[PDB]
């Protein structure tokens, strides 16, 4: 839990430099998903499809 706090501060630096565009709460969900095991291709594919979908729904 001490551990859990430190990792996220360094991780948030990469993601914001690299342009990813995930807030804190969501960035925690993916780390859970990857630890419980997921194909990497699926995870990127959903995130991209949900994002494209969300912007149209709103507008």
């Amino acid at each position: 839990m001490s551990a859990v706090r430190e990792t996220m501060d360094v991780l948030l630096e990469i993601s914001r430099l690299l342009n990813t565009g995930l807030d804190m709460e969501t960035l925690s969900i993916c780390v859970r998903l990857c630890e419980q095991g997921i194909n990497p291709e699926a995870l990127s594919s959903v995130i991209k499809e949900l994002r494209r979908a969300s912007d149209t729904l709103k507008a």
Binding site: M1, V4, R5, M8, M24, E25, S28, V31, R32, E35
Partner: protein
């Protein structure tokens, strides 16, 4: 409306509970840590006692170190976000 800064304590509290939760999922323990009510005026009386060396309901005296032990969780800690959990130990 107000943002958190203006919005008093409650808004900050709701935020702290939401933020901690976010971290709390990856860590697995018997039962997750939760808040157990004390008020801010009830904390200043449990600390009035620990200066003379008497236990309250946040302090458990340990004979093995001859020292006192506060709650380590997300136990209410005032309205501060687990800051009194380290400050009260000093």
């Amino acid at each position: 409306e107000p943002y958190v800064t203006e919005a008093g304590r409650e808004a900050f509290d709701k935020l702290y509970k939401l933020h901690e939760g976010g971290l709390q999922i990856l860590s697995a323990t018997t039962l997750q840590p939760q808040l157990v009510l004390l008020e801010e005026t009830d904390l200043v009386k449990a600390v009035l006692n620990v200066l003379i060396g008497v236990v309250s309901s946040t302090f458990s005296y340990n004979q093995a170190l001859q020292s006192f032990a506060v709650k380590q969780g997300v136990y209410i800690s005032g309205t501060s976000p687990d800051n009194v959990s380290s400050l009260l130990t000093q």
